[PDB]
């Protein structure tokens, strides 16, 4: 069995550079399944789609494999940076001339739904996961400030008939517990990329979420002992 990962610098091997790492690098150790980390720094649901990266996974996935999809950090606005999705949750389309093409730009849920349907057709088990939080201790006071993309991932899961993991909430829960000095130490570059220790915390919070939510992936866990509490 193989688990394919789609995401951005918070998930990717080597993170955002300069010493950081992504959470997808801290899963293999706890799964009986091979992990293929196809996350890439800087990508949004739109640009990951446009770059053919969901299609790349689709073309190698085998029946019974899993695909975990987690975007949002790069999906918001600000002229066309090649990443911003069209606003909304449905069938809205936005047109933009980007890299010499009049591009048809979809909403964040449509991109996720379309990828999910593609993987389901190939026999894969798709897990849509809400984005991780930017450092919630940046101000010295804990702030839980979900982006619109958190619930949009849940919406997408429901429309596509696939599983949802609220990775956001499990990360912010353990960050609240770990506290100000510890969590600030996980963000040496900007408030998004994580140090290796933070990437591991973030991965362990995904695994906690799987145990607590009863996600299908629990079947390939080799332990259920992860820090934090069920939410
Ligand atoms: C882009 O394509 C759409 C859909 O056909 C069309 O309305 C729009 O005018 C085109 N835009 C540009 C700037 O060519
Ligand atoms: C929070 O942690 C940062 C980094 O160690 C520290 O510089 C700041 O003073 C701490 N904030 C307070 C409110 O303790």
> Cα of 72 to ligand 1 centre, how many Å?
26
In whole angstroms, how large is the CA radius of gyration of the chain? 17
225, 55 Cβ separation under 8 angstroms: no
| C-alpha to C-alpha distance for 213 and 231, rounded to whole angstroms | 9
Full residue range of the structural domain in which residue 5 is found: 1-231
Backbone angles phi, psi at 230, to 5 degrees: -70, 140
Choose among 68, 110, 72: nearest CA to 216: 68
The separation between CA 84 and the C-alpha centre of its own chain, rounded to angstroms, equals 16
Q: For residue 207, count CB atoms less than 10 angstroms from its CB and return exposed for 0-12, middle for 13-18, buried for 19 or more.
A: buried
Which residues lie closer than 8 Å to 148 by C-beta, 6 or more apart?
none
Q: What is the resolution of this structure in A?
A: 1.3
At which residue do the structure tokens 């010493």 appear? 19
Number of the ligand closest to the Cα of 183: 2
With contact defined as beta carbons under 8 Å apart, do 85 and 114 qualify?
Answer: no
* Pocket residue to mutate for ligand 1, from 94, 102, 103, most atoms within 8 A of Cβ: 102
Quickly tell me which residue has 């449509």 as its tokens.
Answer: 110
Give every CB contact of residue 39 below 8 A, 6+ residues apart in sequence.
5, 6, 7, 8, 9, 10, 11, 12, 13, 22, 24, 70
Strand partners, 94: 105
> What distance in Å separates the CA atoms of residue 35 and residue 63, rounded to the nearest whole number?
15
> Residue written as tokens 């389309």?
93
Strands 101-105 and 94-98: antiparallel
- Measure 191 CA to ligand 2 centroid, in angstroms: 15
Residue 81 DSSP class: -
Interatomic CA distance for residues 70 and 39, integer angstroms: 9
- Residue identifier of the C-alpha nearest atom 2 of ligand 2: 181
Residues with CB under 6 A from ligand 2: 140, 180-181, 184
Angstrom CA distances, 150 to 64, 108, 146, 227, stand at: 26, 11, 6, 22
102 CA closest ligand 1 atom index: 1
**CB-based contact 55:23 (threshold 8 Å):** no
CA distance 169 to 40: 23
Q: Ligand 1: does its nearest atom lie under 6 Å from the Cβ of 100?
A: no
* Ligand 2 atom nearest to CA at 184: 4
HSE-CB for 76 with a 13 A CA cutoff: 8
How are beta strands 94-98 and 66-69 bridged, if at all? unpaired
> How far is the first Cα of the chain from the last one, in angstroms, to the nearest whole number?
29
The residue whose CA has the least distance to atom 8 of ligand 1 is 95
Task: Give the atom of ligand 2 at the shortest distance from the alpha carbon of 137.
Answer: 1
- Joined tokens for residue 138: 């940046």
**Lookup: tokens for 217:** 């992936």
Q: After which residues is the chain broken (C to N over 2.5 A)?
A: 78
The total number of structural domains in the chain stands at 1
- Specify whether the CB–CB gap between 84 and 96 falls below 8 A: no
Say how far apart CA 27 and CA 32 lie, in whole Å. 10
Burial class (CB in 10 A: 0-12, 13-18, 19+), 164: buried
CATH number at residue 17: 3.40.50.1110
Q: What is the DSSP letter of 107?
A: B
Pocket test for ligand 2, best of 181, 191, 195, 198 (most atoms within 8 A of CB): 181
């Amino acid at each position: 069995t193989t688990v394919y990962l789609a995401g951005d610098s918070t998930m990717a091997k080597n993170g955002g550079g300069s010493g950081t790492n992504g959470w997808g690098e801290y899963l293999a150790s706890y799964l009986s399944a091979t992990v293929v980390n196809d996350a890439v720094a800087g990508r949004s649901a739109r640009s990951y789609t446009r770059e053919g990266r969901f299609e790349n996974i689709a073309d190698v996935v085998t029946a019974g494999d899993y695909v975990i999809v987690e975007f949002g950090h790069n999906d918001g606005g600000s002229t066309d940076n090649g990443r911003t999705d069209c606003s909304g949750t449905g069938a809205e389309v936005c047109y933009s001339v980007y890299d010499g093409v009049n591009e048809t730009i979809l909403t964040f849920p449509a991109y996720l739904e379309n990828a999910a349907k593609l993987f389901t057709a190939k026999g894969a088990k798709v897990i849509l996961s809400s984005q991780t939080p930017n450092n919630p201790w940046e101000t010295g006071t804990f702030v839980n400030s979900p982006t619109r993309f958190v619930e949009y991932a849940e919406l997408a899961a429901e429309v596509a008939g696939v599983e949802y993991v609220d990775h956001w909430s499990y990360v912010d829960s353990i960050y609240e517990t770990l506290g100000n000095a510890t969590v600030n130490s996980y963000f040496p570059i900007n408030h998004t990329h994580t140090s290796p220790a933070g990437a591991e915390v973030v991965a362990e919070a995904f695994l906690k979420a799987v145990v607590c939510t009863g996600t299908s992936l629990k079947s390939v866990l080799t332990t259920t002992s992860f820090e934090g509490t069920c939410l």
